[PDB]
Tab-separated table of C-alpha atoms and ligand atoms in Angstrom:
chain	number	residue	atom	x	y	z
S	27	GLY	CA	0.000	0.000	0.000
S	28	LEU	CA	0.607	3.733	-0.167
S	29	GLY	CA	3.727	4.364	1.934
S	30	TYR	CA	5.486	1.028	1.161
S	31	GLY	CA	7.847	-0.189	-1.583
S	32	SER	CA	7.937	-3.850	-2.697
S	33	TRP	CA	10.695	-4.622	-0.162
S	34	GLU	CA	8.788	-3.104	2.770
S	35	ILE	CA	6.334	-4.910	5.079
S	36	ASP	CA	3.833	-3.056	7.228
S	37	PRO	CA	4.692	-4.119	10.837
S	38	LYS	CA	1.010	-3.647	11.680
S	39	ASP	CA	0.333	-6.761	9.584
S	40	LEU	CA	2.352	-8.852	12.077
S	41	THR	CA	1.008	-10.992	14.926
S	42	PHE	CA	3.768	-12.098	17.373
S	43	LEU	CA	3.210	-15.625	18.745
S	44	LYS	CA	6.404	-17.058	20.314
S	45	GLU	CA	9.986	-16.100	21.099
S	46	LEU	CA	12.322	-18.382	19.149
S	47	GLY	CA	15.730	-17.300	20.433
S	48	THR	CA	18.477	-14.704	20.139
S	49	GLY	CA	21.124	-14.321	17.452
S	50	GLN	CA	23.790	-12.009	16.080
S	51	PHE	CA	21.371	-9.103	15.767
S	52	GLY	CA	19.108	-9.935	18.734
S	53	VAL	CA	15.729	-11.566	19.282
S	54	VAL	CA	13.924	-13.679	16.712
S	55	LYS	CA	10.192	-14.441	16.996
S	56	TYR	CA	7.599	-16.617	15.291
S	57	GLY	CA	4.475	-14.897	14.084
S	58	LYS	CA	1.834	-14.538	11.389
S	59	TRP	CA	1.497	-12.046	8.541
S	60	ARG	CA	-2.079	-10.886	7.873
S	61	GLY	CA	-3.428	-13.439	10.323
S	62	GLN	CA	-2.529	-16.437	8.219
S	63	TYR	CA	1.027	-16.779	6.904
S	64	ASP	CA	3.815	-18.092	9.151
S	65	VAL	CA	6.901	-15.863	9.384
S	66	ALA	CA	10.061	-15.427	11.357
S	67	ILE	CA	10.650	-11.871	12.628
S	68	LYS	CA	14.196	-10.720	13.417
S	69	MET	CA	14.438	-7.625	15.599
S	70	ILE	CA	17.672	-5.872	14.621
S	71	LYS	CA	19.502	-4.451	17.638
S	72	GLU	CA	20.425	-0.791	17.326
S	73	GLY	CA	24.050	-0.385	16.225
S	74	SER	CA	24.522	-4.035	15.108
S	75	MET	CA	23.915	-3.560	11.357
S	76	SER	CA	24.761	-1.172	8.494
S	77	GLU	CA	21.041	-0.682	7.948
S	78	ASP	CA	20.889	1.578	4.882
S	79	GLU	CA	23.317	-0.677	3.016
S	80	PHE	CA	21.376	-3.755	4.145
S	81	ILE	CA	18.082	-2.274	2.955
S	82	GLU	CA	19.500	-1.575	-0.529
S	83	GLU	CA	20.774	-5.150	-0.688
S	84	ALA	CA	17.447	-6.503	0.598
S	85	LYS	CA	16.050	-5.438	-2.800
S	86	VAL	CA	18.443	-7.886	-4.471
S	87	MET	CA	17.934	-10.637	-1.875
S	88	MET	CA	14.131	-10.555	-2.391
S	89	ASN	CA	14.696	-11.728	-5.964
S	90	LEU	CA	16.799	-14.711	-4.815
S	91	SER	CA	14.192	-17.449	-4.855
S	92	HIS	CA	15.064	-21.088	-4.680
S	93	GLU	CA	13.278	-23.774	-2.712
S	94	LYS	CA	16.449	-24.531	-0.664
S	95	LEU	CA	17.095	-20.864	0.220
S	96	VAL	CA	15.321	-19.360	3.221
S	97	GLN	CA	13.138	-16.693	1.573
S	98	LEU	CA	13.364	-13.032	2.583
S	99	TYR	CA	9.808	-11.642	2.586
S	100	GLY	CA	10.751	-8.028	3.352
S	101	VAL	CA	11.931	-5.515	5.939
S	102	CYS	CA	10.110	-3.219	8.377
S	103	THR	CA	12.090	-0.031	7.843
S	104	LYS	CA	10.236	2.928	9.270
S	105	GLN	CA	11.307	2.337	12.818
S	106	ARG	CA	13.612	1.437	15.698
S	107	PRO	CA	14.477	-1.323	15.646
S	108	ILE	CA	13.970	-2.511	12.057
S	109	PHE	CA	12.608	-6.002	11.437
S	110	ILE	CA	13.664	-8.608	8.862
S	111	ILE	CA	10.823	-10.948	7.849
S	112	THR	CA	11.725	-14.411	6.575
S	113	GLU	CA	10.425	-17.904	5.861
S	114	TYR	CA	9.693	-19.696	9.127
S	115	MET	CA	11.714	-22.874	9.671
S	116	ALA	CA	10.081	-24.798	12.482
S	117	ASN	CA	12.972	-27.116	13.407
S	118	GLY	CA	15.504	-24.291	13.850
S	119	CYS	CA	19.185	-24.225	13.124
S	120	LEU	CA	20.913	-27.189	11.488
S	121	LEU	CA	23.735	-27.235	14.046
S	122	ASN	CA	21.412	-27.853	17.004
S	123	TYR	CA	19.384	-30.336	14.912
S	124	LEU	CA	22.515	-32.381	14.129
S	125	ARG	CA	23.535	-32.398	17.811
S	126	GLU	CA	20.244	-33.922	18.981
S	127	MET	CA	21.113	-37.618	19.169
S	128	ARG	CA	17.443	-38.708	19.422
S	129	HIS	CA	17.047	-38.236	15.659
S	130	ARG	CA	19.258	-41.294	15.093
S	131	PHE	CA	20.077	-40.166	11.539
S	132	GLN	CA	20.735	-42.586	8.711
S	133	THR	CA	23.611	-41.604	6.431
S	134	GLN	CA	21.117	-41.264	3.546
S	135	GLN	CA	19.468	-38.472	5.561
S	136	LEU	CA	22.851	-36.790	6.109
S	137	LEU	CA	23.609	-36.904	2.354
S	138	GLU	CA	20.164	-35.399	1.617
S	139	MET	CA	21.059	-32.480	3.926
S	140	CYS	CA	24.293	-31.965	1.937
S	141	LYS	CA	22.342	-32.105	-1.337
S	142	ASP	CA	19.806	-29.520	-0.075
S	143	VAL	CA	22.591	-27.056	0.792
S	144	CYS	CA	24.460	-27.815	-2.455
S	145	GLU	CA	21.368	-27.030	-4.551
S	146	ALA	CA	20.985	-23.690	-2.764
S	147	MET	CA	24.640	-22.898	-3.287
S	148	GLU	CA	24.598	-23.890	-6.972
S	149	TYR	CA	21.737	-21.427	-7.394
S	150	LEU	CA	23.634	-18.657	-5.560
S	151	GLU	CA	26.738	-19.396	-7.668
S	152	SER	CA	24.631	-19.128	-10.850
S	153	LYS	CA	23.644	-15.623	-9.674
S	154	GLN	CA	27.296	-14.755	-8.820
S	155	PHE	CA	26.160	-14.244	-5.223
S	156	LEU	CA	28.587	-15.311	-2.478
S	157	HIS	CA	27.290	-16.517	0.882
S	158	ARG	CA	30.516	-15.414	2.711
S	159	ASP	CA	29.677	-17.299	5.959
S	160	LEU	CA	28.414	-20.773	5.044
S	161	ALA	CA	28.293	-23.096	8.069
S	162	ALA	CA	25.778	-25.378	9.785
S	163	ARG	CA	24.889	-22.542	12.207
S	164	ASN	CA	23.619	-20.554	9.167
S	165	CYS	CA	21.348	-23.314	7.809
S	166	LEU	CA	17.794	-23.942	9.046
S	167	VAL	CA	15.490	-26.975	9.039
S	168	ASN	CA	11.741	-26.891	8.289
S	169	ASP	CA	8.959	-29.080	9.699
S	170	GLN	CA	9.521	-31.646	6.925
S	171	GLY	CA	13.251	-31.980	7.690
S	172	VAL	CA	14.338	-29.994	4.605
S	173	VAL	CA	17.553	-28.006	5.133
S	174	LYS	CA	17.767	-24.500	3.651
S	175	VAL	CA	20.556	-21.951	3.531
S	176	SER	CA	19.987	-18.753	5.495
S	177	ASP	CA	21.597	-15.328	6.013
S	178	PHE	CA	23.357	-15.370	2.647
S	179	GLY	CA	25.572	-12.310	2.267
S	180	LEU	CA	24.453	-10.805	5.607
S	181	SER	CA	28.000	-10.726	7.068
S	182	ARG	CA	28.696	-7.714	4.794
S	183	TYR	CA	26.426	-5.573	7.037
S	184	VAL	CA	27.688	-6.598	10.508
S	185	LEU	CA	29.242	-3.643	12.369
S	186	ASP	CA	30.888	-5.699	15.153
S	187	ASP	CA	34.565	-5.668	14.096
S	188	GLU	CA	35.271	-8.903	16.048
S	189	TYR	CA	33.192	-10.671	13.342
S	190	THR	CA	34.450	-8.918	10.211
S	191	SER	CA	38.245	-9.421	10.214
S	192	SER	CA	40.483	-12.458	10.823
S	193	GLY	CA	38.787	-10.713	15.056
S	194	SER	CA	37.730	-13.103	17.812
S	195	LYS	CA	34.406	-13.988	16.121
S	196	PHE	CA	35.649	-14.506	12.559
S	197	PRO	CA	34.813	-17.948	11.024
S	198	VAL	CA	38.381	-19.175	10.948
S	199	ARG	CA	37.376	-22.842	10.983
S	200	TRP	CA	35.315	-22.429	7.777
S	201	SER	CA	37.925	-20.368	5.910
S	202	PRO	CA	40.469	-21.385	3.213
S	203	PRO	CA	44.164	-20.410	3.446
S	204	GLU	CA	43.819	-17.475	1.003
S	205	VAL	CA	41.095	-15.947	3.197
S	206	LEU	CA	43.137	-16.357	6.376
S	207	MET	CA	46.372	-15.114	4.750
S	208	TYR	CA	45.175	-12.301	2.481
S	209	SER	CA	41.348	-11.867	2.706
S	210	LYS	CA	40.821	-13.327	-0.790
S	211	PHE	CA	37.085	-14.117	-0.909
S	212	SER	CA	35.694	-15.879	-3.991
S	213	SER	CA	33.346	-18.591	-5.111
S	214	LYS	CA	36.125	-20.967	-4.019
S	215	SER	CA	35.965	-19.724	-0.405
S	216	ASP	CA	32.286	-20.706	-0.374
S	217	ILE	CA	33.354	-24.100	-1.784
S	218	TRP	CA	35.856	-24.550	1.065
S	219	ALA	CA	33.188	-23.674	3.624
S	220	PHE	CA	30.756	-26.145	2.026
S	221	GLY	CA	33.329	-28.932	2.550
S	222	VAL	CA	33.558	-27.990	6.229
S	223	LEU	CA	29.715	-27.978	6.416
S	224	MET	CA	29.638	-31.539	4.964
S	225	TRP	CA	32.151	-32.453	7.683
S	226	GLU	CA	29.861	-30.869	10.328
S	227	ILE	CA	26.878	-32.864	9.013
S	228	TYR	CA	28.709	-36.182	8.970
S	229	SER	CA	30.190	-35.403	12.405
S	230	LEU	CA	26.681	-34.775	13.886
S	231	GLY	CA	27.598	-31.185	14.689
S	232	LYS	CA	31.072	-31.485	16.180
S	233	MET	CA	33.100	-28.279	16.074
S	234	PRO	CA	35.698	-28.473	13.226
S	235	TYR	CA	39.262	-28.793	14.657
S	236	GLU	CA	37.633	-29.178	18.075
S	237	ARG	CA	40.917	-29.629	19.987
S	238	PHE	CA	42.535	-26.533	18.435
S	239	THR	CA	42.193	-22.815	18.990
S	240	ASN	CA	41.473	-20.567	16.005
S	241	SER	CA	45.182	-19.614	15.894
S	242	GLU	CA	46.222	-23.273	15.855
S	243	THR	CA	43.615	-24.044	13.179
S	244	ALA	CA	44.955	-21.289	10.945
S	245	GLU	CA	48.506	-22.636	11.349
S	246	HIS	CA	47.357	-26.218	10.656
S	247	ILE	CA	45.551	-25.420	7.427
S	248	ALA	CA	48.201	-22.977	6.203
S	249	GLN	CA	50.714	-25.864	6.585
S	250	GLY	CA	48.495	-27.996	4.339
S	251	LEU	CA	46.831	-30.207	6.974
S	252	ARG	CA	43.108	-30.882	6.953
S	253	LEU	CA	40.131	-32.280	8.756
S	254	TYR	CA	39.908	-36.038	8.426
S	255	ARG	CA	37.125	-38.500	7.693
S	256	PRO	CA	34.064	-38.541	10.029
S	257	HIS	CA	33.179	-42.113	10.998
S	258	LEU	CA	29.749	-41.818	9.309
S	259	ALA	CA	31.202	-40.680	5.964
S	260	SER	CA	31.863	-43.318	3.310
S	261	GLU	CA	35.066	-43.172	1.235
S	262	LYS	CA	33.092	-41.561	-1.591
S	263	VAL	CA	31.508	-38.937	0.665
S	264	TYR	CA	34.904	-38.143	2.195
S	265	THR	CA	36.367	-37.692	-1.281
S	266	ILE	CA	33.720	-35.064	-2.033
S	267	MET	CA	34.273	-32.996	1.130
S	268	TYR	CA	38.064	-33.338	0.795
S	269	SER	CA	37.916	-32.038	-2.807
S	270	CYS	CA	36.672	-28.709	-1.410
S	271	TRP	CA	39.986	-28.224	0.462
S	272	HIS	CA	42.590	-28.116	-2.320
S	273	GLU	CA	45.312	-25.627	-1.373
S	274	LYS	CA	44.979	-24.089	-4.862
S	275	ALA	CA	41.558	-22.462	-5.053
S	276	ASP	CA	41.191	-23.040	-8.822
S	277	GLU	CA	41.522	-26.830	-8.312
S	278	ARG	CA	38.434	-26.863	-6.096
S	279	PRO	CA	35.161	-27.909	-7.771
S	280	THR	CA	32.141	-25.773	-8.578
S	281	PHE	CA	28.809	-26.301	-6.832
S	282	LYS	CA	27.469	-27.783	-10.076
S	283	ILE	CA	30.217	-30.418	-9.998
S	284	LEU	CA	29.688	-31.078	-6.275
S	285	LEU	CA	25.948	-31.540	-6.874
S	286	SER	CA	26.633	-34.055	-9.619
S	287	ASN	CA	29.068	-35.903	-7.330
S	288	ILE	CA	26.522	-35.969	-4.487
S	289	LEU	CA	23.807	-37.303	-6.802
S	290	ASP	CA	26.197	-40.020	-8.039
S	291	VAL	CA	26.821	-41.141	-4.447
S	292	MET	CA	23.100	-41.110	-3.680
S	293	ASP	CA	22.600	-43.454	-6.633
S	294	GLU	CA	25.527	-45.731	-5.654
S	295	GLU	CA	24.905	-45.806	-1.858
D	26	0GW	C1	17.307	-17.392	16.987
D	26	0GW	C2	16.886	-18.119	15.703
D	26	0GW	O1	16.087	-19.249	16.106
D	26	0GW	C3	15.194	-19.783	15.232
D	26	0GW	N1	15.007	-19.225	14.041
D	26	0GW	C4	14.099	-19.736	13.180
D	26	0GW	C5	13.988	-19.084	11.872
D	26	0GW	N2	13.100	-19.419	10.965
D	26	0GW	N3	13.360	-18.593	9.874
D	26	0GW	C6	14.419	-17.785	10.174
D	26	0GW	O2	14.923	-16.939	9.439
D	26	0GW	N4	14.828	-18.064	11.420
D	26	0GW	C7	13.312	-20.840	13.479
D	26	0GW	C8	13.467	-21.445	14.751
D	26	0GW	C9	12.700	-22.556	15.129
D	26	0GW	C10	12.904	-23.141	16.362
D	26	0GW	C11	13.874	-22.621	17.240
D	26	0GW	C12	14.628	-21.517	16.919
D	26	0GW	C13	14.432	-20.917	15.641
């Protein structure tokens, strides 16, 4: 309506129903839009985000639509704090889901989770859109057990310097050598991170390099050493995740190639 662009949601259309948790930018809630449609509502803490830049980018993110990407519905802009409105994912973050041992996952389920993420990432790659912080903590799970990739590109708008530089909150354990050494981000740094995410999935949510500090991790990978095979990963699955960790970025696969490799293993195993 009148005072709203296509990227803007009227906060008066929201019904708040349950507090879901707290994240980077503060509280997240479950609610309904216009009485009917399930949404997640992120309340963005004052001073946490480069808001004008985020809002311009939200225009681009709205047009990223793939069934394995958590959809951005819009932003509530006229106000303090602003809200980000997204697709509700009832089973929450992938990391916590993996860590719940009651699920008793079969390896075919774990490979399906990898395939879900890979499809999302192949779509982002086709749009020349980098995630920049791919990890299990940034994937969500819906009520049907489908994994989707969330918060794609959002790290570009975080004002907390501890998060933004290789900083005490930087994702060292998901980063390739060229990122840690010289801040060279590319499609191939997303590929690296995807390999670590596969490792997280097959490790049922263990922390990568769990016995090392971030400084030790950086030293280990710069010296050419790697994560090794999770017990639940077959030789073929391990080969796929390991392929993401070539020292030379141009020898790493694309997401299209990874997807093909994952589908081959699904057929074989
Ligand atoms: C602090 C974030 O926590 C959570 N976020 C979402 C969520 N859905 N969509 C989205 O963008 N976030 C869904 C959840 C479901 C159960 C428990 C926690 C959840």
